[PDB]
Amino acid sequence: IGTGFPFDPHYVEVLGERMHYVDVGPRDGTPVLFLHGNPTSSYVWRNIIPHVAPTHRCIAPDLIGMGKSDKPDLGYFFDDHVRFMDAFIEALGLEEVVLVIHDWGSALGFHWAKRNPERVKGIAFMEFIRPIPTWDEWPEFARETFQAFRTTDVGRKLIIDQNVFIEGTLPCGVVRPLTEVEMDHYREPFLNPVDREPLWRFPNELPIAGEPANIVALVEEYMDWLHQSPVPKLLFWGTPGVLIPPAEAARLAKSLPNCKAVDIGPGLNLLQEDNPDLIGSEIARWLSTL
Ligand SMILES: CCCCCCOCCOCCOCCN[C@H](O)c1ccc(NNN)cc1
Numbered sequence: 001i002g003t004g005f006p007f008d009p010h011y012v013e014v015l016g017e018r019m020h021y022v023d024v025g026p027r028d029g030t031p032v033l034f035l036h037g038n039p040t041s042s043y044v045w046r047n048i049i050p051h052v053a054p055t056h057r058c059i060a061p062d063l064i065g066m067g068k069s070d071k072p073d074l075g076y077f078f079d080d081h082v083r084f085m086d087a088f089i090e091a092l093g094l095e096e097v098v099l100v101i102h103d104w105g106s107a108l109g110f111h112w113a114k115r116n117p118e119r120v121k122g123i124a125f126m127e128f129i130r131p132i133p134t135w136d137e138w139p140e141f142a143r144e145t146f147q148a149f150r151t152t153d154v155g156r157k158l159i160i161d162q163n164v165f166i167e168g169t170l171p172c173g174v175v176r177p178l179t180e181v182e183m184d185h186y187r188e189p190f191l192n193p194v195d196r197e198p199l200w201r202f203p204n205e206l207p208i209a210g211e212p213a214n215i216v217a218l219v220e221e222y223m224d225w226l227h228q229s230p231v232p233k234l235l236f237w238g239t240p241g242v243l244i245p246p247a248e249a250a251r252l253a254k255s256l257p258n259c260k261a262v263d264i265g266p267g268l269n270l271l272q273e274d275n276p277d278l279i280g281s282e283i284a285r286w287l288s289t290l
């Protein structure tokens, strides 16, 4: 599994900040837009993009405050990322897109797709943001840690000061051991603790047990839209997973229209880091059908 990030940096101005993105493949055709989440960056797509770049344009932005993108003075709420990603999409002049989305990026993709259904030709997703109406539906092994994360004293102490989300939560979202090179690639944007605000605000935006209300409403909305959308869907899942356990993935695969489902084997949250070969191969093959 590759550790290197061999991509020339691209930068675009958006709402006064500079956003970094990978842009490879042919200039023409329908672009494939890769959206990462917390606590990663476009580095999480480094081994999947090369299966798609031979025949399709690949665009992979770094969310604002993450990756190589600018890090302004923000609360980094979900709405901030919504604004910035909308402006990024409109600044690259994209009309029709195929979405490949993960974690909070999925929330960004889905919420974009619901508002622009005519502009989405396909969605490939995995370990995505779904409503969790009670804490019982959250994974037991992450319950205590993510409840502690959702406070302004202990949560900020763990995530902001001690970098627990990068040094602990991130490698526990991967079955196989991450190497020190990959760990350094994930550490790079957050070496300065004051730059760790998104790492803390993201788990505090998670829609668990009705809080926060706005995110619960929004995520419920795009799930309702997805359940009746004819958009072609490609769902990846792993064992035991984090945000999507196998039983939920099977339920969704049976209920979602035009949905191909793929079990990647052992996997937690960062499915890209456990089985990139299968994910990239399946995405290339599935794109061949849009
Ligand atoms: C917004 C997107 C969602 C982000 C979710 C992040 O995912 C992590 C969630 O789990 C964290 C709580 O885990 C506690 C128990 N974990 C086991 O101790 C453990 C230990 C080591 C390994 N791997 N070693 N290579 C795997 C598991």
Ligand SMILES: [Cl-]
Residues within 6 Å of the ligand: 038, 202, 203, 204, 206
């Ligand atoms: Cl999170």
